[PDB]
């Protein structure tokens, strides 16, 4: 089921003119038959902002969020761009809410968006915000202001919080569940949990390669697999690591085993995907997923959390560069550093 023919382009062609309200009418027509695209909302929101109708813009944005649409970064950028000319507590709170959105969803502005954020903070009267484009030292200290970036390490209470909430959703087969729980609970914590079949994407001979090199690092390995794999070179894996072979069904065992093992335990699988809990999951995933990148090497895992963050008197905002294509599984390396004087 589609939009009424050509409506997206009609909307886009209207929003700079005095007839921009007609674009909203068209949007209403679209809503009555399908969920509008993030571009549809982007266009109508910019139309509103272009004509100083800030309430209409924000209501559209909230409507979008309500449909669980992820806004275009270009849309978030528009609110900051128009914000440099707006002096009002309520508009500012909305912009700070967009920053919380980025923080909570582990998202990052593009380079010109970062410039727009910098420009906005530096435009806020009486607050003396200064922005700089920076990197972070190995220690966790911003190369700009000297502050230490939030630790990537969850506190024990945070970890118990996250681990607790995760379990209640895990509790496929009841028979396989209890068997796995018995397996795990009668064994010491592991150091790396390996999803055997998922890692074999870059066959069984690839699994041996991973296990055998990780074993030389004096790590306690747990390899997770399915019944079908053991039908030779798999026997060489079973002897170098602890293994659990579940039914050929997706299973939740990787999470359970890693979390049960504890805050120190890392894992290997494919790219993984209330605000406070989700925020903890992102932070835990960032600091615990071992990503593989001839001879095998893993992605660096930093000591600090690469995420939009604040101390009130400072913000640190990772951003993507135009000239740098970043894989989903690597964290940005460039930061916008904002500090009050
Ligand atoms: Zn800084």
UniProtKB/Swiss-Prot annotation:
The enzyme's main class, written as a single word, is hydrolase
Q: Which cofactor does it need?
A: Mg(2+); Mn(2+)
Question: Is the Transmembrane helix keyword given for this protein?
Answer: no
- UniProt GO cellular component terms: mitochondrial matrix; mitochondrial nucleoid; mitochondrial ribonuclease P complex; mitochondrion; nucleoplasm
Q: Name one GO biological process term.
A: mitochondrial tRNA 5'-end processing
Specify which residues bind Mg(2+) 1 according to the UniProt entry for this protein: 195, 250
Explain how, and how many, cofactor molecules are bound: Binds 2 Mg(2+) or Mg(2+) ions per subunit.
Induction behaviour: Down-regulated following mitochondrial unfolded protein response.
Q: Report the residue ranges that make up the PRORP domain in this protein.
A: 136-337
User: Keywords, A to Z?
Assistant: Disease variant, Hydrolase, Magnesium, Manganese, Metal-binding, Mitochondrion, Nuclease, Phosphoprotein, Primary mitochondrial disease, Transit peptide, tRNA processing, Zinc
Coiled-coil stretches: none
Q: Does the keyword Transit peptide apply?
A: yes
Q: What is known of its domains?
A: Displays a distorted and non-productive active site that probably switches to a fully productive state only upon association with TRMT10C/MRPP1, HSD17B10/MRPP2 and pre-tRNA substrate.
In the UniProt entry, the disease listed is: Combined oxidative phosphorylation deficiency 54: An autosomal recessive, multisystem disorder with highly variable manifestations resulting from defective mitochondrial transcription and translation. Clinical features include early-onset sensorineural hearing loss, sometimes associated with global developmental delay or primary ovarian failure, peripheral hypertonia, seizures, muscle weakness, behavioral abnormalities, and leukoencephalopathy on brain imaging. Serum lactate may or may not be elevated.
Task of the protein: Catalytic ribonuclease component of mitochondrial ribonuclease P, a complex composed of TRMT10C/MRPP1, HSD17B10/MRPP2 and PRORP/MRPP3, which cleaves tRNA molecules in their 5'-ends. The presence of TRMT10C/MRPP1, HSD17B10/MRPP2 is required to catalyze tRNA molecules in their 5'-ends.
This protein's name: Mitochondrial ribonuclease P catalytic subunit
| Gene source species | Homo sapiens
